[PDB]
C-alpha cells in the first residue's frame, strides 16, 4: 500500500451526503416499491427493524463455540488484501491476542454462519425477508435441505450468503469493492465501530472502478480521490447500515469490532445487479468470490413472477409437487 490511510481518515474532502438517516418503522416494502432501494440508509437505533442480535457481550470465542473450533475460515491479510485460511480456533486465538503482540493485521469478513447454533440468534431486518431473492424465489425444499454450514460449493443447495459474522481488529482496512453479484447489504454494528467510504454507481464511476481493477494498481490509487463525490461516514455501536446494489465502498476498523450482516438480491434493481455480474465476468473474478448460482436464481425469478401473476408454472412436475407439499405445512 502506497497511499496514507491516516490522511484518508482525517481530510474533509469526502463530504457528499448520500446516506439517509431513517427510523426502522419507515423501512418497509412500500418504501422499497417507491424508491427502489437506491439510497444508503442508517438506522441509529434498531427500533422497528425487526432485528435480533446476541448478548451485547458475546465474544469471538462464543462465535467459535457456535460454529465449531475446526471450521476453516477465510481470512484477509490486510496489508496485501489477499486471502488465507485458518481454523476458527486459530482465528479466536489471534483475536484474543493483545494488540501489540499481533504480528500481522488480519480481518474476517466472510464467515457465513447459517445452519449453526448462531443462525437463530441473529435475525435480519424484516423488510429484507420480504424481498430477498433467496427467501422468496429459490425452491424452498432445496433451501431447507441444506445441512452443511461451511460454504463448500458441492454441498451447497442454495445461494448461502444470507448471514455473515465479521470480526475485525483495530486497524483493519478493506479496499474499495462492490459486493458480489451486485447484492445489496445490511450491517449491524454489534460491538466496536466502522468507517466507510461510499461511492455511487454512476456509469462513469463504474467504468473507473472496472478500470482500476484491471490496472492492478489498487494499492497505489485511493479510489475516493479519483471520483467527484465520495462520502466518509462512521458507524457506531448499535447502528444498522444498508448499502444498495453496485455501491462502491471501502471500510476501516478503528477499534476491535464484531458485525453481523448479510447480502441479498431483489427485484427492484435488477439492471444494476446484472451490470455488476458482468463486471465480474470481464475482470475475471474466480468463481469462489461470486454469488453462487447467480443465473440459476435468475431463472427461478422469472418463473416465480409468471406463476404468481398468471398461475402458469414452468417448474417441472416434481418441483411443483415439492412446492405444494410445502404449502400444505
Amino acid at each position: 500500500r502506497t497511499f496514507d490511510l491516516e490522511e484518508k481518515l482525517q481530510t474533509n474532502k469526502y463530504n457528499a451526503n448520500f446516506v439517509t438517516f431513517m427510523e426502522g418503522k419507515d423501512f418497509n416494502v412500500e418504501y422499497i416499491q417507491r424508491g427502489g432501494l437506491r439510497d444508503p440508509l442508517i438506522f441509529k437505533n434498531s427500533d422497528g427493524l425487526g432485528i435480533k442480535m446476541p448478548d451485547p457481550d458475546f465474544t469471538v470465542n462464543d462465535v467459535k463455540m457456535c460454529v465449531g473450533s475446526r471450521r476453516m475460515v477465510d481470512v484477509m491479510d490486510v496489508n496485501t488484501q489477499k486471502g488465507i485460511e485458518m481454523t476458527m480456533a486459530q482465528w479466536t486465538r489471534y483475536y484474543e491476542t493483545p494488540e501489540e503482540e499481533r504480528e500481522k493485521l488480519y480481518n474476517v469478513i466472510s464467515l457465513e454462519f447459517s445452519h449453526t447454533r448462531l443462525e437463530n440468534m441473529v435475525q435480519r431486518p424484516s423488510t429484507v425477508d420480504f424481498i430477498d431473492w433467496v427467501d422468496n424465489m429459490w425452491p424452498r425444499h432445496l433451501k431447507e435441505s441444506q445441512t452443511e454450514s461451511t460454504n463448500a460449493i458441492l454441498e451447497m443447495q442454495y445461494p448461502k450468503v444470507q448471514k455473515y459474522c465479521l470480526m475485525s481488529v483495530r486497524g483493519c482496512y478493506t479496499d474499495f469493492h462492490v459486493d458480489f453479484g451486485g447484492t445489496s447489504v445490511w450491517y449491524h454494528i454489534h460491538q466496536g465501530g466502522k468507517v466507510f467510504w461510499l461511492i455511487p454507481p454512476t456509469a462513469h464511476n463504474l467504468e473507473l472502478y472496472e478500470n482500476w481493477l484491471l490496472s492492478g494498481k489498487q494499492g497505489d490509487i485511493f479510489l475516493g480521490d479519483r471520483v467527484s463525490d465520495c462520502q466518509r461516514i462512521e458507524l457506531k455501536q448499535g447502528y444498522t447500515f444498508v448499502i444498495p446494489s453496485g455501491w462502491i465502498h471501502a471500510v476501516y476498523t478503528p477499534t476491535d469490532t464484531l458485525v453481523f450482516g448479510g447480502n441479498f438480491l431483489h427485484s427492484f434493481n435488477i439492471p444494476m445487479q446484472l451490470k455488476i455480474y458482468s463486471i465480474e465476468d470481464r475482470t475475471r473474478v474466480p468463481n469462489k468470490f461470486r454469488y453462487p448460482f447467480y443465473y440459476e436464481m435468475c431463472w427461478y425469478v422469472l418463473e416465480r413472477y409468471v406463476y404468481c401473476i398468471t398461475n402458469r408454472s414452468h417448474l417441472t412436475k416434481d418441483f411443483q409437487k415439492e412446492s405444494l407439499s410445502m404449502d400444505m405445512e
Binding site: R1, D74, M76, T80, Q81, K82, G83, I109, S110, E112, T150, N151, A152, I153, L154, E155, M156, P159, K160, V161, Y164, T174, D175, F176, H177, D179, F180, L213, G216, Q218, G219, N263, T283, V285, N287, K288, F289, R290, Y291, P292
Partner: peptide, 13 residues
C-alpha cells in the same frame, strides 16, 4: 481442498 462459493473479498493488490 473443497471448492467454496460466496466468499466476500475484494481483488488482491
Amino acid at each position: 481442498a473443497p471448492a467454496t462459493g460466496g466468499v466476500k473479498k475484494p481483488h488482491r493488490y
